[PDB]
Amino acid sequence: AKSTDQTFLDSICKQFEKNPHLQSYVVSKDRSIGDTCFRLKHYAGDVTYDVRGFLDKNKDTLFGDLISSMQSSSDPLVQGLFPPTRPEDSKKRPETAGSQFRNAMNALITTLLACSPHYVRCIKSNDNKQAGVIDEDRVRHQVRYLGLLENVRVRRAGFAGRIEYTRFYNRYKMLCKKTWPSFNGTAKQATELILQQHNIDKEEIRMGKTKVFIRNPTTLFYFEEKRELEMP
Amino acid sequence: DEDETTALVCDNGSGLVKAGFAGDDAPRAVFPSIVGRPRHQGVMVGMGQKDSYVGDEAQSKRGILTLKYPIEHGIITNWDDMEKIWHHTFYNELRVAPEEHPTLLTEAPLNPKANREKMTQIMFETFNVPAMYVAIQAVLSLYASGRTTGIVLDSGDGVTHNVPIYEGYALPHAIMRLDLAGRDLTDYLMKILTERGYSFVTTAEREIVRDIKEKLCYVALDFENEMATAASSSSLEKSYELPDGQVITIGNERFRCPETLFQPSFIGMESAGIHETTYNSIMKCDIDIRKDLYANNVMSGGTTMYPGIADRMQKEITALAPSTMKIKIIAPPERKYSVWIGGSILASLSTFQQMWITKQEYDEAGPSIVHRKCF
Amino acid sequence: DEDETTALVCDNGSGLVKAGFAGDDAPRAVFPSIVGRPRHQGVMVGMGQKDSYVGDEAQSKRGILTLKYPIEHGIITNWDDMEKIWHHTFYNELRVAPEEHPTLLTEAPLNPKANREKMTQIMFETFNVPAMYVAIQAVLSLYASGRTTGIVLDSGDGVTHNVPIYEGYALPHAIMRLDLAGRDLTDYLMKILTERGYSFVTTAEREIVRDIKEKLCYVALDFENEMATAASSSSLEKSYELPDGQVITIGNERFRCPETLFQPSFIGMESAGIHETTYNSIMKCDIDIRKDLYANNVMSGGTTMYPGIADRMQKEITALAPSTMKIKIIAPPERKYSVWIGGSILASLSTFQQMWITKQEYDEAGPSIVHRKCF
Ligand SMILES: Nc1ncnc2c1ncn2[C@@H]1O[C@H](COP(=O)(O)OP(=O)(O)O)[C@@H](O)[C@H]1O
Ligand SMILES: Nc1ncnc2c1ncn2[C@@H]1O[C@H](COP(=O)(O)OP(=O)(O)O)[C@@H](O)[C@H]1O
Ligand SMILES: [Ca+2]
Ligand SMILES: [Ca+2]
């Protein structure tokens, strides 16, 4: 209780300042950090927080020694403030904050690892409600701290030109032979049967989930063109 | 409860067994740490007596019971009976298996070394406890009241302990232990009661002495001025109808016994008063560290609940203590559960991990694991 | 601040760490050059003690601290603790990065050669200082008071130095060093205090001796005439209520200890008084250069603040010194910060460029760069 927010800061430095993603003005020599502030890394940048508040801002817990006297009244307003005891959220009522916050965040996770979810992202254009104006510095930043283009390369693997098998198959059908309903089944042996009849190195292409992997850009311009000087 | 897993809080003394569920602010099922058999041979057939009569069931019917207390401040007269006290705690009231949730017990400062290893034997080897610690009485309450810089004197019925803890524990001695509390006041009454045609003879009814004590008995501000007041039968005698039926007009009996607190010379002990021992602990620390100690004094325990307990201290202290700065004593209006409120603190801390004893830790360092890591 | 760039002033001793911002006339955040740990083991958990307790935070609470001073006049008992003294200076109070602004430190005259290279190692290699110099204590104050032709005797708690600087430094020796100031007077009191039922035992409270000293203690004009005056309890004893609460009627205690200053024979040292050593330095210079030295005498330092310090000098000097011309001693009513006022001077000079050490200069002449260019 007596420990203030200032003292709490020192309790972090000693315990860490070695585990990645945490710095301060003491260890990291950076004037940007105040004598009453600290550094903390997130995704792709740096954020220095203040200490004002914290205490009364966090705990906020409320015990049943202040509620009992009030819910003992007889008025649809007074007792009304406290609906028919426990609206599907109780189990155990008196718990010193900390844990109480964990519940709001744990109840969120427990119901995510047992369902089939769907994802949707959004990007705000500008700070003027304009449907045709770009704020260079602001836009590029929005695309970066979300880590979307890294989710593009890494997910696949990490290179240049990439195409889906499921979509590569039903697209490049009328090019090579033995790629007809009389196919074998595998997406590897079939492709080998395709690229071997037209003299193409096999290591240049590799098979995984649903993405073709040919390193370096030049090969793309090499493939596309080759499909033009011998078949309009 | 879809929150965490394995957690609980407990605390025992020479009065009540304070305990509750996981992550609680106040206890839930406190009960007297008693236990006896049958001096009446319990209708031998209207059950094979056994169960000494511990818990509410025991406190309810005292007559049949020969209340023989196990742990008198420090010394444990017998450990064999302790077996079926904790068997009543975790399983009946707490309704939880000790082979799951940790346990936070209290430590009577300066307790025999042989006792710690004996206790651990009862938990780890029998009740299988993979995590537990036995914190030191006073230091706990310090973090509850919201004090970091004060002197604590936590004591109720167990043993008096002057713990100057405001910036460090386990260092110079500056601590004292005195077997003069609770049961000492409970046994002394029957003696002086003899002069008033009253005598709570056996131990069973002796326990009641404490019950009535904590509802009227007060401390005299000055025995001299209240000696002449005795003539005025108004502030002294008060009709107290004994539940059964035998009025006891306690008056001068109220402020005569408590006087022993400040004057241990009434029971053949050279032990100095609680305000002298306070000096003994302060004079050891540095010279430039007293002005802040007097500013705030942590007086805790159920013993600091009687009328005229804090005001008297401010009269005797100032005399043999520096007289320049202001002196204030912080005695929480409910300073008995100060240890439990502090217990709830350490019970929710994770740093506490570097204190308790893990199942394997015991087997890796033998039985001395306790006094090898702890202190 | 849209003026210049990279500038600061500093000064340390055996009392306070005088420092400020860029281009200042007076210091801004002075603090005691102390540092200790915990003889109390700081509630080990109510923080992993560490931080020895340096700075205002240390001076505030002395009790928990075992104030073990690092730099006793010349000798540095340990350099490892110095690491976290300057880490508190530039970063906490000064609020500036040492990897930007220069630094002007002071040099204890005739300091071990091995020390200079060690210090530079802490700045250049660790704290990265591309420009700094360590000027020589006394010479600084000379240009502040507005004197070009005088003899300086600058000393406070560190070491006594007779620096005859009125037309040249670093030349014949004519200088002396005496480890008899400040802490010497701070440790000697507890000894003689024993005869008056007082004893500031440990080092923590020893620091307070200095606090009370600089508010009452004075020097006797003539011990003989003031010996009979002792009977007259009026000019001697004076009620001083110790902040905590313990009156100390200092009287003969005031002018007994300071007598050691002029009489180093009370602590087993053949070192002659500060007025004899003055002769030793004057007799070395030419014969036709004394008449102007006596005209003006620069007495600086916090040691020259006590009552009866300048008038006594004019009594002893005239005796074993030429008696024809007039003799006047210039003792600036506030002659303690004389070094800092002079520090502000050299801090704003550009000629100073041909003195300090540039980042590259260290790597081009190895670690001996200091004693290769400076002197
Ligand atoms: N308000 C009160 N007034 C007087 N005695 C009280 C009060 N509250 C509790 N007590 C008594 O204090 C004792 C328990 O104090 P405690 O400090 O917990 O003891 P211990 O730690 O020795 O077990 C019991 O004898 C109880 O009856
Ligand atoms: N007015 C004063 N009267 C007496 N002592 C003083 C006065 N002002 C400063 N001092 C003392 O002088 C000492 C600092 O003097 P200083 O010359 O700066 O020492 P150093 O150079 O050895 O660090 C401190 O002990 C301080 O308390
Ligand atoms: Ca106890
Ligand atoms: Ca100095």
Curated annotation (Swiss-Prot), chain A:
Top-level taxon: Eukaryota
Annotated stretches, region: Actin-binding: 91-165
Disordered, as annotated region: 74-97
Biased composition (Basic and acidic residues): 86-95
Family, similarity comment: Belongs to the TRAFAC class myosin-kinesin ATPase superfamily. Myosin family.
Main function: Myosin is a protein that binds to actin and has ATPase activity that is activated by actin. May play a role in moving membranes relative to actin.
Subunit structure: Myosin I heavy chain is single-headed. Dimer of a heavy and a light chain. Inability to self-assemble into filaments.
Protein name: Myosin IE heavy chain
Gene label: myoE
From Swiss-Prot, chains B, C:
Superkingdom, natural source: Eukaryota
Residues with PTM N-acetylaspartate: D1
Subcellular location, record wording: Cytoplasm, Cytoskeleton
Region spans: Interaction with alpha-actinin: 110-123, 358-370
Name of the top EC class for this enzyme: hydrolase
One of the protein's GO biological processes: skeletal muscle thin filament assembly
One cellular-component annotation, GO: stress fiber
Residues passing through the membrane, by range: none
Modified sites of kind N6-malonyllysine: K61
Keywords: Acetylation, ADP-ribosylation, ATP-binding, Cytoplasm, Cytoskeleton, Hydrolase, Methylation, Muscle protein, Nucleotide-binding, Oxidation
UniProt gene name: ACTA1
Family listed: Belongs to the actin family.
Enzyme Commission number, as recorded: 3.6.4.-
A Pfam family this chain is assigned to: Actin
Residues where ADP-ribosylarginine is found: R177
Subunit structure: Polymerization of globular actin (G-actin) leads to a structural filament (F-actin) in the form of a two-stranded helix. Each actin can bind to 4 others. Interacts with alpha-actinin. Identified in a complex composed of ACTA1, COBL, GSN and TMSB4X. Interacts with TTID. Interacts (via its C-terminus) with USP25.
Positions of modified residues (Methionine (R)-sulfoxide): M44, M47
Note: In vertebrates 3 main groups of actin isoforms, alpha, beta and gamma have been identified. The alpha actins are found in muscle tissues and are a major constituent of the contractile apparatus. The beta and gamma actins coexist in most cell types as components of the cytoskeleton and as mediators of internal cell motility.
Known catalytic reactions: ATP + H2O = ADP + phosphate + H(+)
Protein name as annotated: Actin, alpha skeletal muscle
